[PDB]
Structure formats: C-alpha cells, structure tokens
Amino acid sequence: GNNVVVLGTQWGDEGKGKIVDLLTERAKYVVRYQGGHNAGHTLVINGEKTVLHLIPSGILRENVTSIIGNGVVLSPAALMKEMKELEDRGIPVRERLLLSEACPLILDYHVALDNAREKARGAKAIGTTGRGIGPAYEDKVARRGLRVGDLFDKETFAEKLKEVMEYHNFQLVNYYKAEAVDYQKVLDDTMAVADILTSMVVDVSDLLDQARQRGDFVMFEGAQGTLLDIDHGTYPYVTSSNTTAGGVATGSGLGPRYVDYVLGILKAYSTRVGAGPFPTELFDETGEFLCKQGNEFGATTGRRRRTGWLDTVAVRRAVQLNSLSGFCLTKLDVLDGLKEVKLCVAYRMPDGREVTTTPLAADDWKGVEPIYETMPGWSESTFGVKDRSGLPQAALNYIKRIEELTGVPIDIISTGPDRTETMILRDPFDA
Amino acid sequence: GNNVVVLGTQWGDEGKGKIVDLLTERAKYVVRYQGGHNAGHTLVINGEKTVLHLIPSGILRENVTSIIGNGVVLSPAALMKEMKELEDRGIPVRERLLLSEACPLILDYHVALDNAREKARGAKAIGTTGRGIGPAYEDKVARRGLRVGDLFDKETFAEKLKEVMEYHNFQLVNYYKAEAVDYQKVLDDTMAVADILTSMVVDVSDLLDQARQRGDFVMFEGAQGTLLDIDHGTYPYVTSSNTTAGGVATGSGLGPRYVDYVLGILKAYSTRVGAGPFPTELFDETGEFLCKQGNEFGATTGRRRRTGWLDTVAVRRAVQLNSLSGFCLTKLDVLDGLKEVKLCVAYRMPDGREVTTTPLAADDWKGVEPIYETMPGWSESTFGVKDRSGLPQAALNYIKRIEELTGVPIDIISTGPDRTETMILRDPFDA
Numbered sequence A, B: 001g002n003n004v005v006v007l008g009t010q011w012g013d014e015g016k017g018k019i020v021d022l023l024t025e026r027a028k029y030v031v032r033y034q035g036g037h038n039a040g041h042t043l044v045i046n047g048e049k050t051v052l053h054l055i056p057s058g059i060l061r062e063n064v065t066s067i068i069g070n071g072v073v074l075s076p077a078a079l080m081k082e083m084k085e086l087e088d089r090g091i092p093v094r095e096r097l098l099l100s101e102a103c104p105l106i107l108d109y110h111v112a113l114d115n116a117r118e119k120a121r122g123a124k125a126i127g128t129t130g131r132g133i134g135p136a137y138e139d140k141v142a143r144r145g146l147r148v149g150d151l152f153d154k155e156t157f158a159e160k161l162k163e164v165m166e167y168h169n170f171q172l173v174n175y176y177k178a179e180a181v182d183y184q185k186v187l188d189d190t191m192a193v194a195d196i197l198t199s200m201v202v203d204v205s206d207l208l209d210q211a212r213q214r215g216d217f218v219m220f221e222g223a224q225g226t227l228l229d230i231d232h233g234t235y236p237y238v239t240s241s242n243t244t245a246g247g248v249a250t251g252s253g254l255g256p257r258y259v260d261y262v263l264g265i266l267k268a269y270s271t272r273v274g275a276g277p278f279p280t281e282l283f284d285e286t287g288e289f290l291c292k293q294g295n296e297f298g299a300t301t302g303r304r305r306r307t308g309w310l311d312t313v314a315v316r317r318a319v320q321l322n323s324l325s326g327f328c329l330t331k332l333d334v335l336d337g338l339k340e341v342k343l344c345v346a347y348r349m350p351d352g353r354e355v356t357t358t359p360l361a362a363d364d365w366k367g368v369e370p371i372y373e374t375m376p377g378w379s380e381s382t383f384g385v386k387d388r389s390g391l392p393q394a395a396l397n398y399i400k401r402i403e404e405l406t407g408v409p410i411d412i413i414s415t416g417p418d419r420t421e422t423m424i425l426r427d428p429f430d431a
C-alpha cells in the first residue's frame, strides 16, 4: 500500500538502512519517526559505503524528500556534521531534507548528563551510545526541553537555554560532581547553525496528511528495534523512545489508521549491542564466527556486537506489537558454511515452565534458557544471490520454518550489504 | 469495526467518560492507554454519578474487563483509593480490572517534584493537575522509574527505590530547597498494597493480540485531548504523554494497524483547564454562560474551566492527527438559549496572513486571532433529546456546518450527562 513502515524486530542493526534505501526507489517521502543519532544505518551502493545516523536513509535519492519527524531527538551539531560529509560527496542534503519544529534539541549538556547517569549506574550501566538521547527525551517529556521551533525567536531561546542549562549544571556539579557545560558555547554553536535548521522546517504532520490524500508512497524508517522499546522493551536496558510500530503515528503526526503495511527487518541470527537479556546469546566459536563473518560492530559506537541464534520467541513478540505484514530476512549469507542452524522456539522459565511468550523487563528474564530446534545448514554460498533458485534447500527450509513459527511471510530476503544483493518477493508498496 | 478508539479532539473534558461507558455495552474490553489520575471522566447513569480518574470508564459493566495499559502512569495510592470507593458502591473493581507490569509507578516524590517544577516556573506555570504525572513520565523515559513489575521481587524493589529516592531528594532539598520525601513511608505505603496490584497483572499486549484474533469488541479510552499531546500539543502547556491516537498502539501493545475506527469526542464549544493558547476563549457573558450552563469545572482539580467558541481550525488538526472516522458531538444542550453561535473557521496570523492551519508550540500562537462564522442559535430545548427530530433546525444546521468544515461525519450527538441522553446515528462498533 501507500504507507510502508520499516522497523527492527530485534535489538536494532537488523538492516533497516539498506532496506529503506532499496525500497525508496518508488517513494516520494521517507520519514524517521524516532531516535536520534544513536542509530547507525548502513547503505552500500555499488560498493560505496554511507553510514547514516540521524539523516533518513532515503537521502541518497534525488527523487525522495527525506523528513525527520517530531518524534526524533535532533542534535544540531551532529546534523551539521553529517550534512557536510554528505555534501562533500555530492549529495545535496539541504536540498532534499525537511524537518519538524517539534523535534527536541540535543545539546552538549544532554551528553553531559548521559555520561553522568551511566557512570552513576556504575556496574549496572545500560551501555548507551554516548549521545544524549535519554536526557533529551526526558527534558522533552518534562516540558523544559528546547525544540527546533524555539530556534526562531532567538532572544527568548537564550533565556530558555540559560534557564535549562542553569538547572542541569547544578546537578552535574553539586550532585554528580561533574564539570558543568558552558551556557555561552552552547548558545553560540547552536546559533551558528540555527538558520540552516529553521530553513528545513516544514509542518510534517500536515505534510503527511496531503501526501496521503494524494496517494504518495511514503516510507517510515525506524531506528533501533522492538526489544529496545522504552515501553515494551527489556526495561531498563532500552532506548528512551518507542521503537515499535506505534512511534510512527506519534512520531510523525500521521493518523495511526494510515499505516498500510509494516515490514519487519529480521537478521537471520541475533546481535545485541548494549547491556541486557539475550537468551540465545553465543560465547563459543559459532558466536565468534557470527560476529566475524557478519562484520558485527556497531555502526555508531564501534562496539563489538553480542551475537546469538535467531530467537523466535522474541521475534513473535515483534509480530504482534508491530502488526507485522511481512519480514525481510537479512544477512542469510552470513550463515553459509555452518553445519547446522538453530532457532529458539520456546523459553524454559526458571521454575520449570515451558513457554512461547517473552517476559517483559530485564529482571523478568533472569533465568530463562532457550529451547532450540536444530536445522541443517548448507556449505553452498548464498552471497549476493538474487533468487530463491540460487538458495540451497536447507536455506529454503530454514526460511520456511521461520514462516511457520511466526505465521508471517518473508517478503524480502537479503544476500548482501549492497542495495542490489537482494530478492524482493512481494514489494510492500504494491500490497 | 472490532477496535474502536475514543479520544478528546480538543483540550480534554469533551466527554470521553460518558461515551466510553455508553458504547462499552457491546464490548469485552476497555483499555486506558495513557495518562494517570489527572484525568477525570464523568459517567452519570440514571442520575447516579461516578467520576473516574485512573480506572477505565468501562468499570461499571460486569460484562467488560477494564485494562490499564502500559502507557498509563500508575499511582498505587490513587488506585487503592478509587478502588475502595467503587467497592463501597458495589462495583467489584478487583474483579473486573486488569493491569500491566510495564505501567510506571507514581509515588509521593513524583508529586513532590511536580510541585517544585511548577513553583520554579513561578509566573509561567503549566497549571498541572498536581499528581506527579510529568515526573513519572520523565523517570520512565530516563529508565530509572519504577514499574508495576518491579513490585514482584520486593527486596530489590527496596534497593531501587532507596536509590531513586536518594536522587530526587538531593534535588528537592539542595536545589529546590524543598523538604525531602521519606524513603520509609514510601516503601511501606507501596508495600501495603503491592499484592493487591500484582494480583491484577496480565500481559495486556498479548491479551489484545488474542482478543483481536478472536473478534472481540475492544474500546480504547483516551485521557486529555489532542492539543495537550506532549509532541503535537501547545508545548510546553501540555501533558507529558501522547494523547493523540498514536498512544493507542504505544500505550497498549496492540499493533497500530489494528485500530479500526477512531472516534473523536467534540464538545460543541471549547473549554480549557490549565495555562495555554486558546484562540476562541471567551471573557464576556457568553463565556460565563458557557461555564455556568455546562457546569464547567474540572472533574479532578476543581478549577473553573476557560470556555470559548468551537475552534474548527484546531479541531481539523485533530482530524488529521487522529485519523478520525467520526465525531461525537457533545453538550449540544449547553448552547440552548443562545441567539446565535460562532465557530472559528480560520486563523488571522500576527503578520496579516489568513490561515486554516494551527501553529505548533504555545509561543507560535502568540498573536493569532480567530475568524468566526456566526450561525443563528435556537431558544428551543435540546436537553436529553434522543433524536435529530427533536433537535431544532438551527441545531441541525450548526451541526451540518461542522461536518462541512471538517469533512468528518458526526456519528453521535449527546444531549446530556446521562448515559441515555444521547443519539447514536452510526455505532463505531458495527462499521
């Protein structure tokens, strides 16, 4: 249908970037509805690599208008920084990127805070990405955060900032005994790029309304994944926003009833970056082989990712939360060369109970062990294959099983980082 | 259809309570997906009054299971308090109410904070309801908030609380120089009702999934209204949550694509409680007559409500944000006796521009004046009328106009506080 949503069904890094970019070929708009620059998507066109963080992954297409919705936490600094890098490479960012005046602003102190909280947590740290995503979402919700629209009347912006900065420094200094952030440098750096920002402002919410009434193919691009959902995720080891399909309406302004199809990006195995429950986590050679073979390092912090088997119990939670319509199975090629492959099909609770449902809150996952279901592998190569035909039978089978255990069709299978190393069985846009 | 959403298209107090209760007759479930006990709904059955705050307005029906979704901020105190009052009146609360372990907990210090922030704001206060709604949403988003699930392992709950309470007292004391909240009394009061709470726990998200797969009529009941939306509302004069239709999926766990119909509660005139932009606000006799005649006082704080004309510019923002399917026109009877009636149809911007769109952020509303469209009134009585037929022509006309200016059909018209003083033209459940 017209409005297609692409999100991460696991713990982010499933392959949203590539997939957004591959499917945008047909779309007018691309909307990031949540997160900030903690995200790190990764598009590879004809072997040329672009890793986007805060800018929508539809940015490399002149025929698509990239929008950053009000749900997103906007860092003026990082935006300018990514902007220039894309511009140096001939991608006229400023020309194809629009933004919301409702977007909260991430400023230096937000990072100051994040660093503090995390240190305070001492040994039980969330393992956040370092930006000030959390604190920015808090200030937002606390109704003291600064938003893009505030950048307009600059005299008052300066009153507001001095005020908020005064607040956060007291804590930083007196409480965390950390060094305060200077109000002047914050004000200056922000003001130096204000005009750039305010320039891209548009009423995204009303924009999506007409795009829709016309029939425009729009694509929502999600950051992070389901189990990182501030609400439904492995709290408190989560991100401070709704990464689940409901952040679409709340993070863009589009009426919820206008989501037509929801595509879940599903990685073929599991990876996690940050502290948190991970039932199917591996610490053996196959664990190493997965990270190694799938170049599993964060596209934003550099951190090695925790690898594990594909958890069907957890993904099935994704199906229901996101109202999935289909799955895009990614990184299949990474499994090539494995003798056999396993997918967690049920959870063994700490008290002997066998369940096919997931707990909800880090703690409530404290002793769960997974009940796999071993499948034979395939030594054949699936890399860049563009057709089921080239996929070996084991593969076809491992894939069919996933459909059975979830009741969700795998509409897209990806055989490589390259925009073109993919098979599209059913295009979300024409369904 | 099966899933029906009922929300406030204005600034809350449109009449959600009555309408939820009237339509639940046909439903298995009722889900509150956001807010806390700042809400104050008001059902009147056969002249008997019940004002609900945190408990779903489907509570007075034995055949409906009331659920409080993870989006809601749960005050153990207030819950118990409302519970007992309903129980004293023969409504077996505990028997028909289920809840989420993901619901954040509002504890004494959250109120301590709210009071502080507001005082800090000195003359530019938001005019919040006094609960600790805001601070609770912040702690949530900050990943330090306590949730219903934490109440299970009580030894650790006590570590967590001591920790969070230590944090908030330092600020209260050292910063706001306010008196700290005792960790012991908080721990005790909470622990005294823990078991009650944990008793109603259910996996709401998975619950809604099966309710849906079966075909159960579910109703989402919203608190506050659209222009109070943390994101899309008149920031910062808003509530700390998404009152717009996207909070349904994010606040229940139901897949966004499963919203079938969205019903907007629209009050016939406008009222606002709290500080904030109010284009069509009245300060004359008609303003008085509206408050007086419509008993316009908050069902939660007691505060007189600011009354004004029905703003079509603002409501049209509601239509698009919520993907409305219909409107329930409430309190028509309150206008009886007026010579003529006006509805704002366009906004006159401070710079001479005429627009039919709304600004987004308190400030960006700083000088807008409304462009009405006077309609003749009707001295006839519409009170408790249960049929268009009894509605005078002026009325029919004032109503038809609303449809024209919005392109949204008025499916329900309400002529009184009583469950039965209403006309249902098209029942959301069978559409």
Ligand SMILES: Nc1nc2c(ncn2[C@@H]2O[C@H](COP(=O)(O)OP(=O)(O)O)[C@@H](O)[C@H]2O)c(=O)[nH]1
Pocket (backbone or CB within 6 Å): A008, A012, A013, A014, A015, A016, A017, A018, A039, A040, A041, A042, A043, A044, A265, A294, A295, A298, A299, A330, A331, A332, A333, A334, A414, A415, A416, A417
């Ligand atoms: N081998 C392989 N690598 C892939 C595939 N899809 C994506 N990648 C790469 O795998 C990584 C996905 O990382 P990431 O960008 O963080 O995922 P995202 O955050 O969802 O966009 C990046 O290196 C991608 O270029 C695939 O199907 N096969």
Ligand SMILES: Nc1nc2c(ncn2[C@@H]2O[C@H](COP(=O)(O)OP(=O)(O)O)[C@@H](O)[C@H]2O)c(=O)[nH]1
Pocket (backbone or CB within 6 Å): B008, B012, B013, B014, B015, B016, B017, B018, B039, B040, B041, B042, B043, B044, B265, B294, B295, B298, B299, B330, B331, B332, B333, B334, B414, B415, B416, B417
């Ligand atoms: N006259 C009149 N009063 C109504 C009507 N509908 C609701 N009320 C009353 O108007 C008020 C609505 O207030 P409130 O409960 O705060 O609305 P809510 O928060 O949306 O549930 C309460 O007094 C209701 O009993 C109506 O159609 N006519």
Ligand SMILES: O=P(O)(O)OC[C@H]1O[C@@H](n2cnc3c(SP(=O)(O)O)[nH+]cnc32)[C@H](O)[C@@H]1O
Pocket (backbone or CB within 6 Å): A008, A011, A012, A013, A014, A016, A038, A039, A040, A041, A126, A127, A128, A129, A130, A131, A133, A134, A222, A223, A224, A225, A228, A237, A238, A239, A240, A273, A274, A275, A299
């Ligand atoms: O507060 P933030 O910065 O969001 O970090 C909280 C936790 O969420 C994790 N985290 C945040 N964003 C991501 C992403 S974004 P994407 O590239 O999948 O869109 N991925 C993985 N971990 C993340 C971070 O790794 C840490 O575990």
Ligand SMILES: O=P(O)(O)OC[C@H]1O[C@@H](n2cnc3c(SP(=O)(O)O)[nH+]cnc32)[C@H](O)[C@@H]1O
Pocket (backbone or CB within 6 Å): B008, B011, B012, B013, B014, B016, B038, B039, B040, B041, B126, B127, B128, B129, B130, B131, B133, B134, B222, B223, B224, B225, B228, B237, B238, B239, B240, B273, B274, B275, B299
């Ligand atoms: O932080 P909170 O407690 O939500 O208060 C913030 C502002 O929102 C306003 N406020 C909060 N909830 C409501 C409701 S709930 P309902 O009965 O319509 O569901 N109504 C009106 N004002 C509200 C409060 O009046 C103040 O203006």
Ligand SMILES: O=CN(O)CC(=O)O
Pocket (backbone or CB within 6 Å): A012, A013, A038, A039, A040, A041, A129, A273, A297, A298, A299, A300, A301, A302, A303
């Ligand atoms: O792709 C982005 N992630 O891996 C975030 C991180 O590396 O922290």
Ligand SMILES: O=CN(O)CC(=O)O
Pocket (backbone or CB within 6 Å): B012, B013, B038, B039, B040, B041, B129, B273, B297, B298, B299, B300, B301, B302, B303
């Ligand atoms: O119906 C509830 N509101 O009026 C909230 C309040 O009175 O503060």
Ligand SMILES: [Mg+2]
Pocket (backbone or CB within 6 Å): A012, A013, A014, A039, A040, A041, A042, A299
């Ligand atoms: Mg990534």
Ligand SMILES: [Mg+2]
Pocket (backbone or CB within 6 Å): B012, B013, B014, B039, B040, B041, B042, B299
């Ligand atoms: Mg009310």
